[PDB]
Symmetry: D2
Subunit: 124 residues, 4 copies
Amino acid sequence: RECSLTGEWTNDLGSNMTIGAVNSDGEFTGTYITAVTATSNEIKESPLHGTENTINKRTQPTFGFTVNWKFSESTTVFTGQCFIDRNGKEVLKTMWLLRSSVNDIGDDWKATRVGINIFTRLLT
Amino acid sequence: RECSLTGEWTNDLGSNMTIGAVNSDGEFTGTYITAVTATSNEIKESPLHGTENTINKRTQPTFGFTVNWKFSESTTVFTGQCFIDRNGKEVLKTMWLLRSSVNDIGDDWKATRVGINIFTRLLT
Amino acid sequence: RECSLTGEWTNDLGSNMTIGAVNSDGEFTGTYITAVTATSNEIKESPLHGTENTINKRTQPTFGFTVNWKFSESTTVFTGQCFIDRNGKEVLKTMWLLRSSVNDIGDDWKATRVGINIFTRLLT
Amino acid sequence: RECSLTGEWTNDLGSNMTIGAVNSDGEFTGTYITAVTATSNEIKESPLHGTENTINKRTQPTFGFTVNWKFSESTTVFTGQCFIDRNGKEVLKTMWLLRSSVNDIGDDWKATRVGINIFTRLLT
């Protein structure tokens, strides 16, 4: 009971993220510090904005967030669920869609990549 | 001339959405309206928060947004690009991931559905 | 009643495909003539191999097929259903995954694109 | 030395598969075995047909295959790449789409689930 979103997280590929307080409407903003950037870069930070679903006030709520990349013209969306694992650790399981910017509508069909990411807490 | 997100749109599925005004930051708010399991209790509306990529102030920007469902524990993410010419008409080309809430971590693998939607200006 | 796979089909982007006879096990092979090839080419043909699901002998059966590209190192998989539309026309609704070849396992996360395709019959 | 498809594998989900021998053409056959809704009636097995891309006889080829379910009307497609070093161990990195059968064309949009699976050599 209590899979909270707020905090610092790290994922399976080296990226880090920090999520602030979740308001009443279930809204939150935060930051994303990436690793893999289809040309990995030093340490570039971008903002994120999402919501957590509050229907039935579930302890392992679903969520979604958009990453507004600051060193590229692409956009990434992440969706998933905040779980309490068998060992009592908080875990974010996610899938994501990476939209690349094309010039012509005739190339739209190849602008979308898909994948997953797993996050666990940092704070230490 | 540019492809603006602000406004009223409808999709190939007959769903409609409204998008507020886009802040300097690329941030926006709106509403998503669908025929919640059509019939039973007609149509419902759920908020939606997202961003538009503004790097290099492109004319046909990429964006993404999260729809926080008001009648289910689910969450949906959309990402795509705002296009022009094909007549001179604005087109929203998107893909989404719909995440269902699951009770146990072992059921995670079957919680994500994926698809597309094309949005056009509301005949008005 | 009778959404059959055998034949010549064309899709929403200009690609063509011909599917041969479906055997007992539900197996079939055929050919794929593409249009968009992340660098569109004249007229390059590649073979395909898939199966149709025969459980309950459904009239609008699900299916899957793999395209073994002959001018590239990638692979594409297609899945969907063979429908009888309101107007009595046969229609294939599909989603597909395009795997690109990477050199290092550290780039695996970006090797997968997703999309859709709609096919209808040719034969005229 | 190369990454061979032929053999016995198991996945992160505890499912197992066998793959026959790969013909000149890149064609292969096998079997997929899972715990069909574990308990009720333990494990079941379903055939599987696919191909391996052989352009430029790469050491870590891409491939795809269709699993024709024997206890449901569903169809599943997998696509990925066969990798090496990480110790000297072969890894199958894949993504799939699972298509459910729907009764009416208007329900098509919710028929496709997407995910990943990592396969490793069967401890034997």
